[PDB]
Each structure stands twice: as structure tokens, then as C-alpha cells.
Symmetry: C5
């Protein structure tokens, strides 16, 4: 009953369209990490490549905090990502809607730290020329906020190495390397824009 009471209280006046910072001049810092599971398909007739991965996202939500003492020792809740503010992290060169492969549930801890790890299949622009060689081919796709600038959302990675420890061992494609690198840029605008570049080098097995 404690958890049920916690959730109702937390979400009574909660807004999912407002960046969850105490002061609006503050940035929301989002840590991003990829676990690449499979290169399913590299289509040289359309230059689309298909990846399956999951994408760990972490940030702090100021308004989703509580003292576990007040609620039977409850330290975590599990909430549909749709009901909380989430960062709108988007692939910048997809060619199809990302397909979701996992339940869209975020795990929130009593200190407000959110963990959200959607599994995804992405088709993105990539010319696989060289994939049939020992050296392999390389491709890249950028991920970032669609509507928030670097003053509103800041992106970080914990490491520039993509997690390959769960890559499908019998994929049609061997992974040779995969990095995830933060990049800052300016344009019209006084404000920095941030993305994480996902670079993959791979070859037919």
C-alpha cells in the first residue's frame, strides 16, 4: 500500500512536459550508452543499415524524490516512460520509425535518479561499400535531442567504447569496433548543440 500511496502523491501535480530541474536555468544532464546486439542487414541497394541495440539513458528528476522511511522502505518505483519527462533522444539520420523491442518502463530511485533502457531496431543511412573485405566498412549515426538545446539538455557518455559484450555471436556481420563520442557544435543561434556520434566498423563474417 505504501508504494501505491507514493505513486499517487508523486504524480498528483507532476508534469511530463516540463524539464525536471528545480531552477529552469539549470541543464538536465543525460548520460547515454549503447549496447550493440546485432547488425541485422546492410542494404546496398538503398544504403540503409539495420541495427538492434539497447540504449541506456540516465538523468535525475528533481520532483521524483522521497524518503523511503515515509513509505515502508520503498526505494525504487517502476513507471511507464510516457508518464514522466524523458529526454527526446533521436537518431538524426534514420530512414524508418525506430521500432521498440522492450517495455517502455523507467526505473526511478528515491533520490530521483532515472534509468531508462529502451531496446530498439534502427534503420539509418549508410553505404556499406567495403563491408565484404577484411578491413570492413564504417558507418555513423548521430543521436541527440530533437527540440532541446545544449543549455537545456546536456549529453554525456561514461565511456566512448560501445558495449559489445552482448553482440550476437552468429550475426551475418562481424563487429570490428564501435565508439560513442560526444560532439558540441554551434550554428543563427547563440547556444551549443550536442549529439553523440555512433560509429560502427564491421564486415561480413
Amino acid at each position: 500500500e505504501h508504494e501505491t500511496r507514493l505513486v499517487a502523491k508523486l504524480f498528483k501535480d507532476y508534469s511530463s512536459v516540463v524539464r525536471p530541474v528545480e531552477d529552469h536555468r539549470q541543464v538536465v544532464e543525460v548520460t547515454l550508452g549503447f549496447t550493440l546486439q546485432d547488425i541485422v542487414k546492410a542494404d546496398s541497394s538503398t544504403n540503409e543499415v539495420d541495427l538492434v541495440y539497447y540504449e541506456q539513458q540516465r538523468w535525475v528528476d528533481y520532483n521524483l524524490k522521497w524518503n523511503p522511511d515515509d513509505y515502508g522502505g520503498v526505494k525504487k518505483i517502476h513507471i511507464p516512460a510516457a508518464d514522466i519527462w524523458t529526454p527526446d533522444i533521436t537518431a538524426y539520420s534514420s530512414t524508418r520509425p525506430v521500432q521498440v523491442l522492450s517495455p517502455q518502463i523507467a526505473v526511478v530511485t528515491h533520490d530521483g535518479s532515472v534509468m531508462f533502457i529502451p531496446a530498439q531496431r534502427l534503420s539509418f543511412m549508410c553505404d556499406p561499400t567495403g563491408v565484404d573485405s577484411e578491413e570492413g566498412a564504417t558507418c555513423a549515426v548521430k543521436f541527440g535531442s530533437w527540440v532541446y538545446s545544449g543549455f537545456e539538455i546536456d549529453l554525456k557518455t561514461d565511456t566512448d567504447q560501445v558495449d559489445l559484450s552482448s553482440y550476437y555471436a552468429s550475426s551475418k556481420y562481424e563487429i570490428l569496433s564501435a565508439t560513442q563520442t560526444r560532439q558540441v557544435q554551434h550554428y543563427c543561434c547563440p547556444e551549443p548543440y550536442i549529439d553523440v556520434n555512433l560509429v560502427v566498423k564491421f564486415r561480413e563474417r
Copy 2:
């Protein structure tokens, strides 16, 4: 809690089915601009071509204005497009439903300026005959309000040049030219004129 109170205030009595003008005799002026990203696929057996692009849309919403000073200095809000009035900009010769490639969130400034930029994959009617020649092939598609006449929605482009600076350099198709041009049309259904922006693309295998 400033932004939260702002949003609750703005949307307490807001209706998304009502054109956002102080006076209904007034027209909503919408600026459209296309950013072409990739010609993914051209199908000569059905004469459908698939485009990936961003569509920049800008208009003013009369009822989404506020003074930053009364709300902690908040200057912009980010609202799902489904929750505000939007221009029903529609491709007139699509052959499949448009696929949405970005979050559907509109950015709204304190002066009521809305900016909404959906990325899309569109299949539309297009004969790619000649795409394998120096001259290439030429296709076009009209974008405009499906249900609002020119007395209700009017369109403007900032330039007739389509933005090609984000076009996929390794695309199977090279863009020779791409324009976006405002047009007026009449349809047998309705006595009033309707406005569209005609996207004309000339392209060729690389």
C-alpha cells in the same frame, strides 16, 4: 514550479480544434520550409518514390502568450503537437501514410511563436523514368492544409530554394534541383481557394 503553473494556466481553457486568432475573420499565416535528407527508394514498377526530410513549420498562436517576468523568467515551453492547434499540412499525392521519424513536440515562445519541425518519410507518386540519364527525372508534390481554405490558412516560404545542406552525400540519388513554391488552387468540392507549397525535385542516379 513556474513552468508547470504557466502550462496549467495556458491550457486550462485551451482548445486545439480552434484556429488561434484573436479574430476569426483573420488568417493564420504559416511559414513552411523543406530540408531534404535522402531519396531512399524509387520504384519504377509502381511509380512511387520515397523521400526523407524535415518540414519546418512556423506560425503564431494568439493564446500562447505570456510575460516571462510573471513566471520565473521562462521564455519557451515544449508541448506535444497533439495538444495545441496545428496546421493540418498534408502531402496531396502521398501513396502510403507518412511515417514520423522524430518526436512530435512543438516549441512555443512567450510571444506565442510556435515552431514545429517533424521529420518524415513520404512515399509519393513519381515516375523515375530518366533517372538513369544526365537529365534525370523530375517529380513534384503539393503540401497544404487539407481542410482550411486560404481565408483560414495562408502559406509562405522563406525562400523558394529547398535546403539541401543536410542531404545524404552517399544517397543513391543526386539532387539536381529542389524548389518549394507557393500556389493557389481550386477544388470542385469548395468555393474558396486553397493554398499549397509545391515541392519540385529533379534528381538522378549517382
Copy 3:
């Protein structure tokens, strides 16, 4: 402000599930018209043909009337089709769910007249045999109410000549002719007539 007040008042006690008539013994008269844009493909291996068109529907909704004078001169509103009653006009021999290619928004005038013009892509049962000859091929599909009798919904066309003036000029298929013909059907099952509009298309490879 006025339109918002109008809309609030009209849909306070509105039911999208009841036919919009003063008394239930009255019939709703729906006028249908097709504007055919493209035969995208004709599949010889399954005998399915894919059409892109938009379908003008008009009828009067008794409970959607107002005096513009009481509402700042507002002459019409734009309401999502899902929120008003609509005629459940359905193809009787489709092979896939219809794909929606336009916003689902109805236009309602102050005298209650509703205009709703969905753009659609439809696969239906059709044998393309002879499409590669000069005589061409002929196919047909009936449109009508799924759950309402002829005493509840009646169908009319303004003309039996389909609007072909917007047909895609570089389609893989030329349209030889297209008619939209009201048919009245009597089944032993029912005393009441059943009414459909028969879309007949003669076509061939360009």
C-alpha cells in the same frame, strides 16, 4: 473566444453514437463522390488492385446548428471526425485495412451541413486480366454502410461520372472510365432496402 464557447456548448451533451436526426424514423442522406488519383498497382498473382483516391461525404447533422450572430459571426467549425457521428461507409470487397492519407477532420457549417473528405489507399478484389490489351481490364467495388439499413442511411451521388480530372498523369495505368452508381438492393432477410455506391473502373497499362 467565441468558437471555443460554441464548441464547448455543441459537444456538452453530444453523442457520436446516435444518428444525427430530429426523430429516429428520419433517414440520414449521405452524398458520396470519388476523386480518383492513382492506380498504384494491379497484382496478377493475388488479384488485388491498389487505388488512391479521396472520397467526399456530405450530410446534415441536426444537432450541429447555431446562429453565427450569437457567436461573433462564426460560420463554421473544424472537428475531428472521431468526435461527431459519421456514416460508416465501407468498401465491401477490400483485402486490407484502408490506409488513411489525410487528417480526419470534418468541416461543419452553422446550418449543420457536414463535409468530410478522407483520402485513402484501398486494396480490393480485382482481376487485372486484359489490362495489357487495348480493351483493358474492368473492376468494381461497392461502398456502403456496414451496420445501417437504407431507412437509416441513404446514399446519393451528384453524378455517376467519377472525378478523374486529378488523376496522376504518369501512373503506370491509364483510366479508360470510372463510374460511381447508386444501387438499391432487396434481400429476403430484410423488408428495408440496402443501398450502396458501385465504383466501376476500366483501366489499362499506359
Copy 4:
């Protein structure tokens, strides 16, 4: 006016999650009937076959009754199927989610009689070998409640002969025969018997 009041009354305390019977110990009798319109496709590389048909369903809802005199003489209402209790009739050997071709609207008569006739496209497990011969091929698929046992939902047909009077006369396949036959089955999960209607079609090019 009258109808709007009838509908508000009927559904004030109605629940679409509760079998519509006065006595819980009573069974809901559902009459089931198929109208086969077309065999669209027969895929010999995956042994899937695609049917288009109308599925006629009929039952009584005890709580959707009224006297026409008390409501301006309205004798029928037309309600989204999702808003009333419906039998969860399911194909047991489909290989894709069934596609709905018609409006999901049920017609309820004042005596509580419900008529619901979804048109569907179904891909189901079927080996079309011999479809190119005079003998043709024969496939079958069961239809029944997914979660209600024979003690809760019973199925019946009015005839064992599938209705072929609407069959597409220029289909790639002609129907040699098509029957619909009530069956009782037991499944490993549950001790109660379950009811289905077996659709058997023999066809050829």
C-alpha cells in the same frame, strides 16, 4: 434525444469485462457463421494462406434490454464493439495479427440480441501443396474463445456449410468445399473443455 437517453441509461453501470448473463452459472451461447469472400494468397515457401471473410457473431446481452415505448420507439442501437462485452473469438493457428476490414460496431436490439459482423483478413498455417491439381489442397483453422471455457461460452453454428454466395468469382483460387464444424477440445493449461468452430477449406488454382 430519446436514443441518447437510452444509451446513457444502459451504460451508466455497464461493464464490458463481465459476461452478460443474469446467472453466473449460465453459459453465453454464441452463434458463429463464416462468409468466405476470397482466398487472396497461398504462400508455399512459408505455408501461410490468406483468407478474407465476414465472421457473423450473435448472442444475447441480458443487460442491454429496454422497452421501445419508453424511448420514442427506438428498437435498435449501434455501439462500438469495444464498449460492450464481446466474445473473444480467436483463430488458433494464425501467423499474423488478424486485420479488421470493417467498422467495429455492434448492433443491439431491444430484446438484448447482439449482432456483430467483423470482416477480416487472416494469415494462417496452411500447406497449399496440390493446389495446382484437380484434387486441390485442404487446410483448416479453429475459431474459438481464447480465455472462456465451454462452461462460460458455448459456440454453435446454424449450418455446417460455409456461406459461399459472396465468394469472389475471379479469385485466383476456387473453392471445392468449405465447412464450419463445432468442436470440443482440451488444452494442457486448463481442466475445462473449450469450444471452437473448425473451418475447413479445400481449394485449387
Copy 5:
């Protein structure tokens, strides 16, 4: 009347986002078992296989208990899966969103025991090399909670032997053997163990 009354009481303050245990320190034990129906397709150019099956899930919901004597003798209710708490059982190596082939309705008994048996079509990562030989091919996929650890959701099977008694006998592929085996995994992201059931399928061309 009784059942309606019971359902209203059960769900007045029910939360589907809260694990249905009395004490939050308690684990929810979920029994899983697969019934394989068909290997539809095995794609050697992408190494994906398409499997049709249904998946029996059983657990106890602490808050969905009642005395049948208090409610006309009602012993079972039938509730859409989406309206109760359910374990988020997920295939860990799927390559397409899973397709649901059955109504999503859970059966709940008066002692709170829930039975939920979704039928599904799954594409998952699978190298069919050898499927055209007598030894056939072997693939595996793990099923488990996505967001709940072994301290919150545990899994059990009744048997390691997968139910093959309903397998389609005219499938393009035959199943030589199939096992379902409980396992415990550890991830770097999270300090707690996670439970899965590993489905292993050996199969070949018929």
C-alpha cells in the same frame, strides 16, 4: 450484478504499476511455459527466424482476492492484461517488435491466482546454418523481465521440456527438440541479478 460489483471493488484503488505483493520485500514468482506452434520462416541472409507460439504465465496477485460467498459464488474474473499488473516478460534478442496473435485477457481466480497466455509471433536472432542437413540447426532466445530483478520477479518452469504437441505438422520446418531452462544473469548497469528462461530450439527443413 455480483461480478460487476466485485470488479468495481477490486479496482477502485488498484495500481497496475505496483508489484502485487503484500510486503515490497517479497518476490513475485512467475511460472512460464512455452507451446511452440510453427517455425514460419528462417532467413539466412539476415539470420532471423520467425516463431509462432503461446506462452503461459502464472502468478499470484495479492490484491485480487475475494470470498465467492460474498459475491454470488463468482470464482473467476476476466480482465484485460493492460488493467492489472503483469510481469514485463521480454525476449532479449528479438529483431522486430513481437506481434500479438491473441486477445490480451488475464484469468484471475478468487485466491488471486492469475493465468495469462498471450499467443505471439517473434522474430529473433538465429543462424539457420545446417537446417538443410540431418543434424539441423540450433538457436536460442532468453525470456525475462526487462526492468525487475530477481529480488522482485523470479521465474520458474514446471518442466524443461517444451510443449511440442501442438506443433504444426506441415510446417516447412520440423522441431527435433526444444527446451526451456531457468537462468540467472548479471549486468554491469545494475547491481542485482535478473532471471530468464532460455528457449533452445533445434530444427531442420522437413
